Amino acid sequence: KALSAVILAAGKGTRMYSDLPKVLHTIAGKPMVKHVIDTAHQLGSENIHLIYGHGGDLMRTHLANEQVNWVLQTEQLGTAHAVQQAAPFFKDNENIVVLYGDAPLITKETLEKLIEAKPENGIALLTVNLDNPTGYGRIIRENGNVVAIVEQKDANAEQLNIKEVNTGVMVSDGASFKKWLARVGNNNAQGEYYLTDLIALANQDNCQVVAVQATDVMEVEGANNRLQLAALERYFQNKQASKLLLEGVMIYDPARFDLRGTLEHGKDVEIDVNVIIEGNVKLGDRVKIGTGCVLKNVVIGNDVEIKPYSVLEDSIVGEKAAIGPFSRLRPGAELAAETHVGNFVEIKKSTVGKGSKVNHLTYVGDSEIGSNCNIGAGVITCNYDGANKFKTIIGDDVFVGSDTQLVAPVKVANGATIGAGTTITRDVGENELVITRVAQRHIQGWQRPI
Amino acid sequence: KALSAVILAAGKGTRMYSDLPKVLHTIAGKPMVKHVIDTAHQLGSENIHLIYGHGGDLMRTHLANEQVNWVLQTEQLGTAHAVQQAAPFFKDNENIVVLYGDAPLITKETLEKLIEAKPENGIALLTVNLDNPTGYGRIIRENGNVVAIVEQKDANAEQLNIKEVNTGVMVSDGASFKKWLARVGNNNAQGEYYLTDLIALANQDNCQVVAVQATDVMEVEGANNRLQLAALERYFQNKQASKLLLEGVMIYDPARFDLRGTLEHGKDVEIDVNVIIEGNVKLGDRVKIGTGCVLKNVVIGNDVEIKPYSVLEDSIVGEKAAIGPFSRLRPGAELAAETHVGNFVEIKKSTVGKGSKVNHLTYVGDSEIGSNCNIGAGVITCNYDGANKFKTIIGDDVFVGSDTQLVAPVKVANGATIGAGTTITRDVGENELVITRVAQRHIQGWQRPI
Amino acid sequence: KALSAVILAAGKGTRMYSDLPKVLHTIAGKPMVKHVIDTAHQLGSENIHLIYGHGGDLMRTHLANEQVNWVLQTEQLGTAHAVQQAAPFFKDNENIVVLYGDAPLITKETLEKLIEAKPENGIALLTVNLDNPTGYGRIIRENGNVVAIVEQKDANAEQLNIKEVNTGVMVSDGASFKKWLARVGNNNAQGEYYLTDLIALANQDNCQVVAVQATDVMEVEGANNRLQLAALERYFQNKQASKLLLEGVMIYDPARFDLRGTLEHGKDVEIDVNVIIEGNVKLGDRVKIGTGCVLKNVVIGNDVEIKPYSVLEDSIVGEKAAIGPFSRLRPGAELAAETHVGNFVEIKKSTVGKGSKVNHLTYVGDSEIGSNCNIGAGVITCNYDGANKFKTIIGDDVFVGSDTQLVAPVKVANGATIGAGTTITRDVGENELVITRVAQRHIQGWQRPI
Numbered sequence A, B, C: 001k002a003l004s005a006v007i008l009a010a011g012k013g014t015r016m017y018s019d020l021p022k023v024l025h026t027i028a029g030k031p032m033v034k035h036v037i038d039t040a041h042q043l044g045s046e047n048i049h050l051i052y053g054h055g056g057d058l059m060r061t062h063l064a065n066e067q068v069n070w071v072l073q074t075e076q077l078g079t080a081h082a083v084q085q086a087a088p089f090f091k092d093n094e095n096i097v098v099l100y101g102d103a104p105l106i107t108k109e110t111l112e113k114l115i116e117a118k119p120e121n122g123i124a125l126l127t128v129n130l131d132n133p134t135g136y137g138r139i140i141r142e143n144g145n146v147v148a149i150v151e152q153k154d155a156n157a158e159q160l161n162i163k164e165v166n167t168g169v170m171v172s173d174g175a176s177f178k179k180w181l182a183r184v185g186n187n188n189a190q191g192e193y194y195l196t197d198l199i200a201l202a203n204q205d206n207c208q209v210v211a212v213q214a215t216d217v218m219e220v221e222g223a224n225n226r227l228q229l230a231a232l233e234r235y236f237q238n239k240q241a242s243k244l245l246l247e248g249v250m251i252y253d254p255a256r257f258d259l260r261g262t263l264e265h266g267k268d269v270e271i272d273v274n275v276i277i278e279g280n281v282k283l284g285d286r287v288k289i290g291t292g293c294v295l296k297n298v299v300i301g302n303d304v305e306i307k308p309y310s311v312l313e314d315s316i317v318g319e320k321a322a323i324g325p326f327s328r329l330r331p332g333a334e335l336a337a338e339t340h341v342g343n344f345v346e347i348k349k350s351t352v353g354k355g356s357k358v359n360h361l362t363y364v365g366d367s368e369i370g371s372n373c374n375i376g377a378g379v380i381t382c383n384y385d386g387a388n389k390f391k392t393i394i395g396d397d398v399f400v401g402s403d404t405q406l407v408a409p410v411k412v413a414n415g416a417t418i419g420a421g422t423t424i425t426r427d428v429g430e431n432e433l434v435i436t437r438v439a440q441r442h443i444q445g446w447q448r449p450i
């Protein structure tokens, strides 16, 4: 049967001390609530009812493309009241899973188990065992059935020893939610309608409440401040790193590795310490990434070595290429197979053909460079003062001497040779040699001021 | 009543295998003893009696500006003998707190509690509970009063089970210190006068000895070698990081963050992994610091992004500025609001006006650059061979073409335009265009040696 | 008496998901089996019998210079069968130690203890205590003698409580190995000949089997996948870091330090976070290494400071030199005492004499630079288009102006002065001043397009 989700995401997150609302703070570069939205979608949720409130304007702007139902909460009256704002949109015959926008690490797998355990017209409740359950709602079972959730201040000495606690995550059908939520009262010290009461109400109607235990407590932990968020970040990164290690990615130190997006990898990929992978990154076979590198939205072909302290974004690198150390590829850099980009080199929105080398102290922007070119040290592509940024076209088999200024728009045809210290403003023809004629003054017997 | 401190700092620290004396080794960039001196001052200590000895010459040079009384120890005869060298300078009616120069993490807060617990004419003793107290002096209480400190080799089976141990830190009044220290003997296996005997002597005179427990054992741990020092460093950095996280600084990985000095911050500040903050650093609201950055003595305005692998020192950065990646700001760099400093750029002792850009492969030193200038790639400010380093003055709205050499002293007035590859030795006037006339030799049909 | 080793190294390591065989994956930059080969050699092994199989071709190429006996295994029939392939080469009167190529952290010291404990005509067995010994062969002692090793599936309730387990490492004499290995059978669920049976067989012949316990369980752990390998890497690096810390090297964070080879150090050496030391590195007294540096095969003299994000390889640095930040020394860089190499500078296969400075945005390759030279910003040594890479010779006391192109082969003699923006193609004589005569067009009242 069908499934929909309700995600609670209205909290201010005061102890974040931020202008952002609580759930927009990120884990692995992705807002906490977006983790939960994605998980809900992976589960095959038909609708996703997002209960929002504080920072509502920023929620709308940051999540504008999410396929969610925008249910605004104007007052905090507990979890049952929040969920009831979404309940008119529940289908009687679909399951509803309740989730929390500030508890981002809940997994599809745990939720599949939970959903499978839900007995007809009953509830599946997610629980977890804690060594010190102090302050959490104790799960009371009679026989092997869950009958109630007893809060810390209500529990007796025998109940306080119960290690199994309530996580707040539960599954029931829509009809049962609409029915039971209407029977929830708020006659308590907080004056709030509590979702925990659905466990009692279910048993009241001779409906079964089954418990499923979470794999890791971190799946159900919420982040109330940046310290707690950092702990979730580290647990998540370790989990990501472990998965990649077991798939055969050699990550030299998984405690010094960060993935903030998605990584597709070949075999025998080696990643040294302090690498950051962002957005969508694809690495071919036998790719070696040196220490300190940052790759954001890149495709790296087989057998490429990226040496230390290289920063790449929105770029493509062909097989057997060599990048770094201290290389900068900015958006639109496309390096063909067997290319060489060296230290203190910046490539922006340019194509560099097979076998070409750009090895020192160079800026190439808005350029097309052909195959087997030699781009000498200190070469700079530049523009005239004025408007837009025009293109430099360099053909195949061109030698560009060190410190050459290539002033766009300009074309250098196949097989040209440009001497060092040249300023190229006019097009260079095929097999044309251009060398700068220098005027120098020579003074003999000049004694230095030393 | 008044307070003064005695800090023991005479040890050689042989297992450091260093030419430095023990207490000059640093935690968070600050000598261990300086941590303790500062804490003593935070407590409002009137005098700080520093017992020193080994590496005395280096102690004097490194701590020359500290407001301490320099009490030289010529021989090791135990803690009571060390403290007695300072005792002639104790005021009868002030409290005296005893501290250790190689135990740097003792907190003001713990010491306030200790000082408050000191009963009139009595002693307040700092204690700590250990799971394995083996080798530490056991605290013996009778009723709820501390009566003795029993050393490991003296303790009976029942006493060896006591988990509460002596840390060595204590508070008493000056009169009581002068009195009891004179009654301490050295008839023991080390032949040393022990400060622990003051607990007995106090009870002997019907004076009360009250115990206060330290928060963390790391407050009372001493560093005897670099391994132990590293452990103190890591605990201290984690504590610093946690505080900042709870104040709302987003530190992506607190295990990969270092603060060596002081940080003042706005809201929504983000600090990526492997950042080092040194000296006095001020960050405004919404500052983003990328991976690998080093900031030493800097002021960074609101909304500034510092991209990866940038190194900044003794610099000021205005709001909405953009720095990095691979940017170097050396002392005296002053960047106005909305400026742009890019990769492989070095700025030294220069002012850069609002909206100006210095984006590639450039050295600017001893310069004033105005507002809305375009400093092209490969631009270098330089001097003539000889003496001092003179100034380059660039006005507002100037375009400096790529690879221009600006030879100081020189001035370029408002609205000037300088073509690429130019050497500027003479002043440039307002709205003056200077372009380099090149001589080139063109040879057609030059077949490259390929 | 003599000693030889047998190392089992035939496994495929399927869960590495690699084209490499299991034991060629590295710890600290060195293949796992090479760790074990070296340890065996440190113990004074006369022969080293390497049992190999999967990835045999790659084993031969990667380990071609190892002094090992190449014993090929064509089928897996257990540890006793593997060892028996080597047994014809055992000398009757030498000890034989059995080791595993995928258990790289076994120490010489532990193995010395093991070898000393071996009773005449008996076996010394390496054991370890585990809190949870589930799945490991339990060591059964009668009196205080080891009589058997009982496997998990065979053990009774009382035996399952035994915490002491078999590591697989053992020592016996060659005659005893040849004898007992021939009596090992394979009538078991795997159909394999097990080395564990030698413990029974020894007791059968009234020979004593003595047990020695490993220091750390990590000495006997094998790496079956990259996750487990990473754990061995981290344990090994921490152990290396701890040793250096206790020798008096100040390593600011040992969890962010990597040694992949050997380090020789002086006193008062300081190493900041995220440094990587590779190959053979020698650091003199008071060397300071800043954050992010990479040193591979370098010799660094006394009092040298290497500032952040510098990468050095196959280089020599004289005393009191200053390198970085953002410096690149490539193979064959030789810097004399009191030299200065600054940001965005690349030095390759060049000698730089005493007191000389190369401080910005510079490439020096295949060069000899004398003493007290000033190599200005933007200076580039380059070649003509064509064949080999020729040399630039710069004498003592030379000033090379910013942006100078030095076109090899060329010589600049003692005391020469070269103005900024010069292209040097012809030799420069002693005390010769060369300055570039520029042609510039000046246009007044040029209004910029702004």
Ligand SMILES: COc1cc2c(Nc3ccc(NC(=O)c4ccccc4)cc3)ncnc2cc1O
Pocket: A008, A009, A010, A011, A022, A023, A078, A079, A082, A100, A101, A102, A103, A128, A136, A165, A166, A167, A168, A217, A220, A221, A222
């Ligand atoms: C972020 O917006 C909301 C979060 C809520 C919220 N967040 C939350 C998430 C996870 C936990 N985690 C646990 O209760 C827990 C943690 C560990 C072990 C067992 C339970 C607690 C609160 N809980 C209840 N109502 C909420 C309402 C909101 O508008």
Ligand SMILES: COc1cc2c(Nc3ccc(NC(=O)c4ccccc4)cc3)ncnc2cc1O
Pocket: B008, B009, B010, B011, B022, B023, B078, B079, B082, B100, B101, B102, B103, B128, B136, B165, B166, B167, B168, B217, B220, B221, B222
């Ligand atoms: C550095 O100079 C001195 C240090 C001393 C010194 N340092 C010291 C500091 C802290 C401890 N810490 C503890 O005793 C301890 C640690 C953990 C738990 C309980 C107690 C021990 C010695 N102790 C005694 N006399 C000292 C004399 C010196 O001149």
Ligand SMILES: COc1cc2c(Nc3ccc(NC(=O)c4ccccc4)cc3)ncnc2cc1O
Pocket: C008, C009, C010, C011, C022, C023, C078, C079, C082, C100, C101, C102, C103, C128, C136, C165, C166, C167, C168, C217, C220, C221, C222
């Ligand atoms: C890599 O090639 C081989 C490895 C083997 C091998 N490797 C190995 C190494 C270490 C362990 N470690 C332990 O058994 C262990 C670990 C922890 C505590 C106690 C025992 C296990 C297997 N064991 C047995 N036969 C082997 C045969 C091979 O060709």
